[model samples]
Target chain A: MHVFYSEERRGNLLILREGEVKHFRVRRIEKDEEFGVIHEGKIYVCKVRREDKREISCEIVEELETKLPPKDITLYQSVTVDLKTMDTIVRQATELGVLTFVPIISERSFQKEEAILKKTEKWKRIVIEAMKQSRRPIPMEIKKPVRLSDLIPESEENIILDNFYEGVKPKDVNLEAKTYSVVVGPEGGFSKRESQILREKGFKSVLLEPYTLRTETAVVSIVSILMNF
Target chain B: MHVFYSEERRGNLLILREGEVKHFRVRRIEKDEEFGVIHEGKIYVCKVRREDKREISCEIVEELETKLPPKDITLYQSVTVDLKTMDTIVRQATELGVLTFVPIISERSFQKEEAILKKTEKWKRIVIEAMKQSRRPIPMEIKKPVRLSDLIPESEENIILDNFYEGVKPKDVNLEAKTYSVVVGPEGGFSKRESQILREKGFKSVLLEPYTLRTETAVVSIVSILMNF
Candidate 1:
């Protein structure tokens, strides 16, 4: 059975306040029904009149909500290509509670405008499906793909994942700021020219570890670690 | 193109005496034979001219008589129903150099014999696919599922993931042991009775932290933390 959430009032069942209440809907209800609808710190069963409208019945149940509130995390990538890898990243990143996704076309990116536009719609669908699976309230935004040179100038603290450059571990990266962006690269990784551009624009490229990680793996790992931190 | 590994000698291919030789057979050879093969170390590429060969000719790409060996890490999991989650785990774990996988069926598991039989084959296929995707040389194992009761009595220490239980942080967990088993639960989580059983069996139920993580997330986070530690 599907339950619908409504804002309008409907008879006595309008505001099903969180408390113990008798459900007058059925004569004999199972134990599961008793614990199904939770009221304020109490479980209640709706009492129902019999077919003849003479007798009433109610079932006891517990009402408790323990689901954690959704978290908001941001995901930023250099460019969008490799549909499979991008889909996997979006799905897993949303499952990890990333709220926004920004796909930036870096300096070394070879993606054309038509290609990026085509993928934007596909990525939005991926984000929606991912949110449904993860039971999160908000859907991630694919956002307009911006140029790396432009994004870097506006970014507060640009973080880049580089295996060769030694820096703070992912878990140790400070994320107390309100807005944070993580920039990852394509298959060939960032070019020397792109690195120089980012450095001049105040972006800090940090190395993850000794083991070389693929672009997709790096995104998931970095995002997960950032959320935990 | 499919590649095969063998220690036996082929035509015009030099066989190594003691060390591991990472060799590949290449086709469509030309003056620039290096295009057909990729070698990072001091290795020899043997060229052979075939008169009866078709348009595509096969040649021994490279012969490595000596090479530095790779390290191995053991990966253990209890109950393997979530193939999607397990697939991601295996792929990332393989990339992280996890060599072995031991699947254990815990007391709280709802997996039946038929289900286990079906999943075992699927799990093996997933492991192979993940290995190929990650491009890892070491193949992973999907051992026959063992009962948690029987597994706890073994020499290896068991680390069970529990949100409410008392345990050490991931960074503090000792990874010096040769073999370690990281036990995670199903969607509904482990039963209270099963928790008692695990405690009595000397298994340490460790909690990740403030955030309540899903089963797969817990598995990935714990594995990453332990491997890093």
Candidate 2:
């Protein structure tokens, strides 16, 4: 059974069919108050009124099917890597309400082009399963793996996670107004040349912490810090 | 191959054998530091030069297999649950340096006694694997699953995570002075009567948040929050 949030329902009322009244708490009510209700898998807006016994009677006027708004955050990660680590990252990222996922291949990434392409479908399936397991209503967007160079050109604020490289910690980095494009390297880590290229491309390299963290650990820890803030 | 900390080897030096003499960092030598080294499938700590390394050849003593102190934190958790979730909890908890693991059987738990008994060995194996993956030397203690009643008596503070129940957030809960024993329920959650019993036994009924969370999610989130603080 699908659950819907509505203002027309009243007092723990279950609406079995059209024109049924349910008594529930309405935070705001007026004579010409516009109310919304989900009926038969659709949203309907109508004018409601209080009848004889403090009951609201709603008359439907507009009905439209619309997609829900996107969730607050998104995670752009990689695929064709260690599945265990990827699963952990996806789970943590979803729990943090990351609604979209994009896997990018960097210069030093171990995932080959054909392998990443093949893994895209599997990645999508994993995201959906993880979302259901986490009980999140938001569906994840798993995009085809793109090159780091290509991604960085279009990225707004590209933040590369490198423990050995220089950059601000997650706590110190200000993410209040900007949408983040976090680029994490594969196992061997970003080459010095790659780091230089990222720096040249306006991608700020930030150290996650003092400790040596695996790729997935860094991703999850970064998500945790970002979400909490 | 195992890794150990030795002070005698300076600046990322790899020692193939015990008798290999190496230079030490001048500052590290005066501080009586120890170095991390890998040798013959074991990790051990060897003392650096007790005296000044100003003398061209200073002899450093290899300590006689001094055991590292045991872990301080104890994880009282539930097994026979999702192995993926347990794997995550073990990995993250090991990263946070948790000492011991105690799996307890709660009233509403679905784990069979036989299965739980079998999982004890499996859980120990997972902990060792997690320790190796996290690259931490701390060995995790995986005890046999005990009854909630039996476990609670040994706990200094018992915290039951309740989404509907009222209490301060676990992050706000002071764990500064007490040894914490966090009880995470199985799939369906703790029965009303079970919650009442815990409350009667002076266990704090703490609420995580308004969002409904699965048992494993709650466990990871709660442990992450508490241990990070």
Q: Pick the candidate with the highest TM-score.
A: 1
Q: Give candidate 1's chain B TM-score.
A: 0.65
* Candidate 1 residue-wise lDDT, A1-229, digit = tens: 1011112233333232111122222323433333232222222333322212332223332222324313344566766456567776766666666667777676555477677778878887665444433544345667777776675534344577765455566555555544566778775577777766775676667665324556767776665555544
Cα TM-score per model: 0.64, 0.61
Local accuracy of candidate 2 as per-residue lDDT tens digits, B1-229: 2233222344333332232222244223444455534333334444433333242222334423423322245666655356556665656555555667777677666467787777567666665545444455556677777766664534566677775576666545654534666776765567787777777786777775323455655665555545434
Q: Residue A205 deviation, candidate 1, in Å?
A: 3.3
Where in model 1 is the C-alpha error above 4 Å? Answer: A1-73, A78-80, A106-142, A153-157, A163-168, A175-179, A192-196, A209-214, B1-73, B78-85, B106-135, B153-158, B163-179, B208-215
DockQ of each: 0.22, 0.08
On DockQ, the candidate that comes out on top is 1
Error of 2 at B11 (Å): 24
Report how far off residue A217 is in candidate 2 (Å): 4.4
| Model 1, docking class | incorrect
The digit string of per-residue lDDT tens for model 1 on B94-196 reads 5555556666666545467666666667776565444333333345666766665665534355677876566666545554554566777765567677766
Full-model lDDT for every candidate: 0.53, 0.54
Q: What interface RMSD does each of the candidate structures achieve?
A: 5.0, 6.1
